[PDB]
Design a protein around this ligand. Structure first.
Ligand SMILES: Nc1ncnc2c1ncn2[C@@H]1O[C@H](COP(=O)(O)OP(=O)(O)OP(=O)(O)O)[C@@H](O)[C@H]1O
Ligand SMILES: Nc1nc2c(ncn2[C@@H]2O[C@H](COP(=O)(O)OP(=O)(O)O)[C@@H](O)[C@H]2O)c(=O)[nH]1
Ligand SMILES: [Mg+2]
Lengths: 208, 35, 352, 37, 326, 149
């Protein structure tokens, strides 16, 4: 690393600095006074104080890049968002009066709910002894299941069975399927939840 | 020699790697340092 | 609805309508614009179920010029120019919609760049063995020309015997529609059918039978270079194409009874840098000499009133779905990120 | 390439002593051979 | 020693590229009409009319397709010479698929039009007779990574053994490109492959429209006639590197073409190895131009599957239509 | 003591210090090519052909002499200088003049300082850099000449 150990990661949150000094508790006030003596790393290219910033979509875009091509990955992400938006507008226009109240048209809400519907709660962690890597059920951390939802969505969309259908079109279709609790990613979550129910012998090993 | 060039027309220190290393290590080649 | 104007008749727009969106009816969309609108404006029309164009100073100025045009003097060339995605094509569309309502005969070329690149079936013209034909490019245009001007194709009657083949000829006095029909049925005669149409439209307009509007978007293609090749991998010049050679005759001001309106475009150009937008840079010496004298009209980024009106139109259509877009901070960030550029603003709002 | 530029260049070649006759590039290797030692 | 990119490789198609309308767009070009006149003189029937306008059933017969392809390939070579003399001048290699070799050799100055056409003819009738002797066929199979070809041929053979037949034939006949092959032999074995592709892990299967199982031992009767047709012919040394199909390497001396051209008749076509031998090189080196002189564009697709970077500089000579009336 | 790089000689002279007329200067610049730098108005002739340095100095002086003399000389052949090969843009006998004359004759049939401003605008747009100021001057001139308001 080119940064010395004393350098600290920056805090890009903008409303954080606008809190009145009155609200600040003694601990938060001490933290703020401490921050003045430290060196702060340069903010990396990426996150910004923008109001449209979305860390989940940023992480999904980073997980889609191939070979450092961020422009293409962001282009694909925005194309997918626009495709979801246009599909929802088409479905809203053609719907009758009482079905227009239950049709979501915000693509960010759909993306977040689709990824949430695919998160697994429990997974299997192998453990080594005797030459047998013992598969014990484990409650997945939040970060782990968040990563797994995104990875399953991307791997599902990268399948070679989908011939010449462009990535934004596949991804919007999969996202709208997962929004309604349907599709192969939801089944991949279910086939892990049942296959971890099939191995509840070693369900109490709490020291993975 | 010159005839060969004509008919064709008609158509750093010069030492071994070892001996160089010894002198360069002993400081006998002027200007050659180690990185 | 501060971003809308009830005035849906382009013949009565003025400086008080600047920045306001007027509506084009579906009948006018399918008749006047089978092919005119930009590809990304058509998706907006499909998504919003309505075509609404903002009234801007370039279009207002060009409409003022066309209302006070003398039809006895030779046709005046108007050239719209500006930086990328500033809305010159849609200004041209505003003017075309104005002219179509007053029973002008509209000769609209949606993109002259498509005729100088990526042609798979290029032929040798029988009329002139030194020129090349583009049957798919010509027949595709003829269908939409017929769609726009279906009313006049029977009134307008040819003035010469045109011989398609030893078996087939168009007799003197037959309606122009037959010529158009001959281009649509047999594509072999599509390119020769375009030229005849132009030859007639230039001539009869001079007699005073009708007023003619020649609306050519991406006009800098005509006097540039091509990416079309012979079988021996040699280049083809723009003047060697019959379709391009016949369309240059209509840019010359050797006729009266109409106006010539043109829009430059670097997008889709050949052998031009991304930042070239001025008339001479895009036209070349040959193009500038051909169009000179002409009236250049500048299209620029949105001013604050125009930008606020565009975002209010999008908000009225519920097209900005992010919760912060309605707020002032969202509008300031959109303004910075687009710099009031219509195309960048629309693209950004597409995924918000 | 205009004619004017063409033999204007060919006059410049005569002034600076280059090969006036444009001898493509494969047969100019004689020039490089005899230029050096 | 010239950088590759200003060099040219001429690829000559083989049987299966016939189409109604070969020759149109080549006739008006220099020197083609007397090639077709000589074709009439040697064959005994008017090849020109049959290739230009035919039922396509007369053209699909083995006796007729091969001479058509040979003459059309040479006429396309003449057209390419007229349009681009430098391409023909700077030629490094040549290769034909099955019958295109007879064209390629003729293009290389190793054989003459009359003798080459006679050899192609005799080959054609001999192969037709061999096909008539026993039912057989050719089956194009595209496999996946888990597909096993020698294995599948084996069960196809025990099938015919169970049915009862002397030495059933089913063996890979044409190496085209990775995981795509052409099997050849008795029709029952090919039916077995078609029906149980599932256990043979074959993604696609397509019966070729051919008379019999070419490039197998079933064509053994046709070897001896063709050999005679070649004894009289005096084969010279090819001017360009002409690549063989029996073993997929350059023809070295005139004294081996005589027997290699007969071994081809009963040996698999090594097209993939030929493409590898012509185009394989380090990443970053430039590839020579490639011209498919003859009907169709099949060799283009095969080259795309084999080597994409080589395919980037590929073009085909149009034998169905011409841009400019010469 | 020998060094092969000591034979090189570089002569530098400003063309403004030579007695050249318009045609002579144009010919000299076109002959020399890249040796002439427009920013500095300096002609830089580097000679290294000969073995010695006095010989290269004499050769540089001889080159300068012959370049000057052949710049002051007009061949018969010179007369065919094409328009594209011009350095500036002459408006008389130009396509712009031809087209505007045709347009004015047609307008008079349908029925000057303005022509001076029009030609000024065209000459600016053709020789100098093309900015929106020049484009607007051209627009105003064309509107006034075509009776557009
Ligand atoms: N008058 C207008 N009314 C409504 N939207 C407009 C208008 N002008 C521009 N826009 C918006 O800007 C986008 C770009 O406009 P347009 O395609 O006309 O630009 P252009 O300058 O002709 O582009 P190019 O240089 O690419 O040819 C349109 O799709 C629309 O989103
Ligand atoms: N097939 C056919 N095409 C014609 C005929 N007349 C005109 N055209 C076409 O219509 C176009 C009119 O262009 P024109 O005024 O005649 O200029 P030209 O090319 O010099 O002859 C021509 O370029 C032809 O392509 C005709 O009598 N028969
Ligand atoms: Mg445009």
């Amino acid at each position: 690393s080119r940064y010395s150990p004393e350098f600290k990661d920056p805090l890009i949150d903008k409303e954080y600095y606008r809190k009145p000094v009155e609200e600040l508790t003694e601990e938060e006030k001490y933290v703020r006074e401490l921050k003045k003596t430290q060196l702060i790393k340069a903010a990396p290219a990426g996150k910004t104080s923008s109001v449209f910033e979305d860390p989940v979509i940023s992480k999904f875009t980073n997980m889609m890049m191939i070979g450092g091509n961020k422009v293409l990955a962001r282009s694909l992400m925005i194309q997918t968002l626009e495709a979801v938006k246009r599909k929802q507008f088409e479905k809203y226009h053609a719907a009758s009066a009482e079905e227009q109240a239950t049709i979501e048209r915000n693509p960010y809400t759909i993306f977040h709910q689709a990824l949430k519907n695919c998160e697994p709660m429990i997974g299997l962690v192998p453990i080594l002894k005797g030459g047998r890597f013992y598969q014990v059920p484990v409650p997945l951390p939040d970060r782990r299941r968040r990563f797994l939802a995104m990875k399953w969505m991307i791997t599902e969309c990268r399948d070679k069975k989908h011939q010449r259908t462009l990535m934004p079109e596949k991804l919007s279709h999969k996202l709208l399927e997962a929004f309604h609790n349907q599709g192969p990613v939801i089944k991949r979550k279910h086939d892990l939840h049942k296959m971890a129910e099939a191995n509840r012998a070693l369900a109490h090993y709490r020291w993975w | 020699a010159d005839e060969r060039l004509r008919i064709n027309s008609l158509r750093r220190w010069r030492l071994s790697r070892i001996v160089f290393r010894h002198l360069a290590d002993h400081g006998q080649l002027s200007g050659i340092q180690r990185a | 609805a501060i971003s809308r104007t009830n005035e849906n008749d382009p013949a009565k727009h003025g400086d008080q309508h600047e920045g306001q969106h007027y509506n084009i009816s579906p009948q006018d969309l399918e008749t006047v614009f089978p092919h005119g609108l930009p590809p990304r404006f058509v998706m907006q029309v499909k998504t919003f179920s309505e075509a609404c164009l903002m009234v801007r100073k370039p279009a207002l100025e060009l409409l003022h010029y066309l209302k006070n045009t003398s039809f006895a003097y030779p046709a005046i060339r108007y050239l719209l120019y500006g930086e990328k995605g500033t809305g010159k094509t849609l200004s041209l569309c505003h003017v075309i919609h104005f002219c179509a309502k007053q029973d002008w005969l509209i000769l609209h070329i949606p993109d002259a760049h498509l005729w100088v690149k990526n042609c798979r079936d290029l032929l040798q013209s029988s009329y002139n063995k030194q020129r090349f034909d583009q049957p798919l490019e010509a027949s595709t245009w003829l269908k939409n020309f017929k769609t726009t001007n279906e009313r006049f194709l029977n009134q307008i009657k040819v003035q010469e015997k045109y011989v398609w083949n030893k078996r087939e000829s168009t007799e003197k006095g037959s309606p122009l529609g037959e010529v158009v029909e001959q281009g649509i049925t047999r594509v072999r005669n599509a390119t020769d059918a375009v030229g005849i149409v132009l030859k007639e439209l230039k001539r009869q307009s001079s007699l005073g039978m009708f007023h003619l509007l020649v609306a050519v978007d991406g006009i800098n293609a005509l006097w540039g270079r091509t990416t079309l090749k012979r079988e021996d991998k040699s280049p083809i010049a723009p003047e060697e194409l019959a379709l391009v050679h016949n369309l240059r005759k209509m840019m010359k001001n050797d006729w009266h009874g109409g106006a010539i309106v043109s829009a430059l475009s670097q997008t889709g150009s050949l052998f031009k840098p991304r930042k070239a937008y001025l008339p001479q840079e895009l036209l070349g010496k040959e193009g500038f000499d051909a169009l000179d004298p002409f009236i250049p009209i500048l299209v620029s980024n949105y001013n604050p009133k125009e930008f606020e009106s565009c975002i209010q139109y999008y908000l009225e259509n519920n097209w900005l779905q992010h919760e912060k877009a309605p707020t002032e901070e969202g509008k300031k960030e959109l303004l910075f990120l687009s710099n009031a550029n219509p195309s960048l603003l629309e693209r950004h709002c597409a995924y918000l | 390439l205009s004619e004017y530029a063409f033999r204007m260049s060919r006059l410049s070649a005569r002034l600076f002593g280059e090969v006036t006759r444009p001898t493509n590039s494969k047969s100019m290797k004689v020039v490089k051979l005899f230029s050096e030692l | 020693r010239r950088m590759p990119g200003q060099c040219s490789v001429l690829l000559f198609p083989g049987q299966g590229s016939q189409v109604v309308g070969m020759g149109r767009g080549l006739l008006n070009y220099p020197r083609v009409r007397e090639l077709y006149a000589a074709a009439r003189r040697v064959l005994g029937y008017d090849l020109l009319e049959l290739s230009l306008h035919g039922p396509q059933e007369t053209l699909d017969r083995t006796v007729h397709c091969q001479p058509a392809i040979f003459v059309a390939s040479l006429a396309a070579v003449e057209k390419l010479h007229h349009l681009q003399p430098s391409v023909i001048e700077n030629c490094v290699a040549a290769a034909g698929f099955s019958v295109g070799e007879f064209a390629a050799l003729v293009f290389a100055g190793a054989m003459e039009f009359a003798e080459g056409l006679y050899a192609v003819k005799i080959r054609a009738e001999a192969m037709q007779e061999a096909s008539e002797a026993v039912p057989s066929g050719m089956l194009s199979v595209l496999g996946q990574p888990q597909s096993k070809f020698n294995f599948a041929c084996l069960e196809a053979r025990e099938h015919c053994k169970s049915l009862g037949i002397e030495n059933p034939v089913c063996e890979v006949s044409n190496y085209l490109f990775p995981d795509c092959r052409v099997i050849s032999g008795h029709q029952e074995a090919l039916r077995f492959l078609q029906k149980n592709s599932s256990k043979f892990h074959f993604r696609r299967t397509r019966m070729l429209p051919v008379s019999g199982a070419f490039h197998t031992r079933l064509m053994e009767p046709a070897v001896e006639p063709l050999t005679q047709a070649l004894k009289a012919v005096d084969i010279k040394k090819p001017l360009v590197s002409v690549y063989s199909n029996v073993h997929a390497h350059r023809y070295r001396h005139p004294g081996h073409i005589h027997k290699l051209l007969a071994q081809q008749l009963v040996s698999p076509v090594k097209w993939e190895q030929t493409m590898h031998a012509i185009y394989e090189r380090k990443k970053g080196r430039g590839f020579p131009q490639t011209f498919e002189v003859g009907p169709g564009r099949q060799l283009g697709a095969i080259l795309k599957s084999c080597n994409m970077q080589a395919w980037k500089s590929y073009s085909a000579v149009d034998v169905l239509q011409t841009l400019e009336h010469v | 003591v020998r060094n092969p790089r000591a034979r090189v000689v570089v002569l530098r002279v400003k063309l403004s210090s030579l007695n050249l007329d318009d045609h002579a200067k144009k010919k000299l610049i076109k002959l020399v090519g890249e040796r002439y730098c427009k920013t500095t108005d300096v002609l830089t002739i580097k000679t290294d052909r000969c073995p010695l340095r006095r010989q290269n100095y004499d050769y540089a002086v001889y080159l300068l002499t012959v370049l000057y003399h052949e710049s002051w000389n007009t061949e018969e052949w010179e007369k065919s200088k094409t328009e594209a090969d011009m350095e500036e843009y002459i408006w008389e006998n130009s396509s712009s003049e031809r087209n505007i004359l045709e347009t004015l004759l047609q307008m008079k049939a349908a029925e000057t300082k303005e022509i001076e401003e029009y030609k000024k605008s065209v000459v600016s747009l053709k020789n100098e850099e093309e900015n929106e100021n020049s484009i607007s001057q051209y627009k105003e001139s064309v509107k006034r000449l075509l009776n557009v308001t």
